[PDB]
């Protein structure tokens, strides 16, 4: 009795699940070959990024022992990146399988203390990257909930966009890096909140008369702005 | 030709992906949903109403708010069944043995 007879059609019919498998098993059904994803991009550890940090490009220090070999983003990518899907794009900034800095705690109180001091979250350390489908599902659920909360709100799509950008930047495993990208939509939402409030509660101000040189040149048109 | 997409253009890449031989319905990508809170919420509501765990499990039903169904499965029903029969008989359509049905379906769906 053999194990898994009808379960390896990929092997029976030389069907590669990816160019890496194609190159390995020598099926040669990918016309464009394969450019291997190097190990520094397949795995690695979290690193400091800012140039205004002294330990820049150095691995992040944790209470537990950690391999300090870092994930290197793709800084000099090739001109042709035939697969421009999220699957192949995410590997340039994160490792699909997650970082290699996860702990195996010898006890429960060590885990407790790390969490209590803000140095561990399983959501952040024991996890992979999110697939495009998962990101879209989360975004659409959040959008439905926001619409149900209030349809006649102006900052709705702004909140949805900051959520979307966090999910796309993988804030679960890179919260600081993702906030660095989403704080702009947060700020726009703040502005829209003030604007909606001032439109609801009539808030206006006495505008001063028009300046003597409002137009730089007499022949120039003074486009009227509300 | 296919240039790298920076990390700042990924939100638009998710809902307007590039063209591929097997594209999704971009107009329907905002409609793909799968609620992870369905059964927890159902149980919470029922237990708050006052039912027991067994009654809740008997009254539970799967989520209807999932990704909509393809209208082709209802409009091109007969053509799809014929194509599947052709495939089952001809080993998956090797060396263009179901081109007939596949092309009929493609024309019906595309119309130039």
């Amino acid at each position: 009795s053999i194990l898994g007879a009808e379960a390896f059609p990929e092997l029976l019919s030389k069907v590669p699940l990816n160019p890496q498998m194609d190159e390995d098993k020598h099926f040669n059904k990918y016309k464009w070959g394969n450019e291997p994803i190097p190990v520094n991009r397949r795995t690695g550890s979290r690193m400091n990024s800012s140039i205004y940090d002294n330990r820049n490009h150095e691995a992040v220090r944790h209470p537990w022992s950690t391999d300090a070999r870092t994930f290197h983003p793709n800084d000099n990518p090739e001109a042709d990146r035939i697969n421009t899907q999220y699957s192949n794009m995410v590997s340039d900034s994160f490792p699909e399988g997650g970082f290699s800095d996860a702990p195996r705690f010898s006890s429960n109180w060590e885990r407790l203390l790390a969490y209590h001091h803000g140095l561990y979250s399983p959501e952040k350390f024991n996890s992979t990257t999110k697939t495009a489908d998962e990101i879209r599902l989360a975004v659409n659920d959040f959008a439905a909930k926001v619409h149900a909360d209030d349809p006649k709100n102006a900052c709705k799509y702004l909140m949805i966009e900051e959520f979307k950008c966090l999910q796309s930047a993988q804030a679960r495993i890179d919260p600081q890096g993702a906030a660095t990208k989403c704080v702009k939509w947060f700020n726009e939402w703040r502005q829209c909140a003030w604007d909606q409030e001032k439109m609801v509660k009539g808030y206006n101000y006495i505008e001063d008369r028009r300046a003597r040189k409002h137009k730089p040149y007499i022949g120039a048109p003074d486009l009227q702005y509300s | 030709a296919a240039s790298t997409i920076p990390i700042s253009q990924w939100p638009s890449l998710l809902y307007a992906p590039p063209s591929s031989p097997a594209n999704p319905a971009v107009e329907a990508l905002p409609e793909m949903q799968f609620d992870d809170l369905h059964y927890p919420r159902q149980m919470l509501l029922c237990r708050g109403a006052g039912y027991s765990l067994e009654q809740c499990n008997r009254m539970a039903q799967p989520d209807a708010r999932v990704t909509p169904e393809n209208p082709a499965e209802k409009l091109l029903k007969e053509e799809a069944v014929a194509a599947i029969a052709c495939l089952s008989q001809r080993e998956g359509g090797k060396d263009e043995q179901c081109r007939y049905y596949i092309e009929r379906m493609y024309k019906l769906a595309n119309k130039e």
């Binding site: 799509y157 949805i160 966009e161 | 939100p11 809902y15 307007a16 905002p30």
Partner: peptide, 8 residues
């Protein structure tokens, strides 16, 4: 569609 997918 959403108003933020528009760029032009």
């Amino acid at each position: 569609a959403s108003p933020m997918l528009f760029t032009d």
